[PDB]
Write a protein that binds this ligand. Structure first.
Ligand SMILES: [Hg+2]
Ligand SMILES: [Hg+2]
Lengths: 120, 122
């Protein structure tokens, strides 16, 4: 959940040089708390395997760019639903925002898979 | 693999024909090159229906399609040249490597977006 740089390296099992390069290119970043999440471990492990096929850290900038733009769109769509959460006795509940976010990601992913299958 | 007629897609997705119409006219969902739908269209249609139920109209999904098409090209630039590099032994098919590579890049991209989204709502 909340991983240090050392934890990230140890769990991803990549070279420190790879991590350093992916941070330098902005491909991976820490969250608002200043630590890494489980997604970072998966990004790092996928980035290592891709580097092995010829993809440099520098080439994954395009993926990060697009993911940030997609996150903005999702925010616009999901952000309004934070206030509609079934809070119960608590003051806040973002569970519907998370549901809309997860549906939009699954939709977007399936579009990619479809288009990639086509072009190949 | 799997080539669905329009009515096969409606039956498997349990989504209304009018919703499919709206998605096709917005350009969010398209048929493959032969005029069939694939298994991914089932998921897309069902996700679009649940999104519509949260007030997100098919036309507001257009941007996910355009983005998906740009990403698909970036993945093809990587994977495309590796088609010819797959082992072609008796127990192999040459498409495998380019598929594995596409699947890594898609997994990478999915994690990036999940990470960017967690942060945009933290
Ligand atoms: Hg991996
Ligand atoms: Hg879905």
């Amino acid at each position: 959940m909340r991983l240090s740089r050392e934890d990230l390296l140890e769990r991803s099992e990549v070279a420190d040089e790879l991590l350093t390069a992916l941070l330098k290119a902005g491909v991976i970043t820490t969250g608002p708390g200043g630590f890494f999440d489980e997604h970072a471990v998966v990004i790092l492990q996928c980035a290592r395997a891709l580097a092995e096929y010829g993809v440099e850290p520098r080439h994954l900038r395009a993926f990060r760019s697009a993911a940030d733009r997609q996150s903005d769109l999702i925010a616009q769509i999901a952000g309004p639903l934070v206030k509609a959460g079934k809070a119960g006795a608590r003051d806040r509940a973002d569970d519907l925002a998370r549901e809309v976010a997860a549906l939009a990601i699954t939709l977007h992913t399936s579009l990619i898979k479809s288009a990639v299958r086509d072009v190949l």
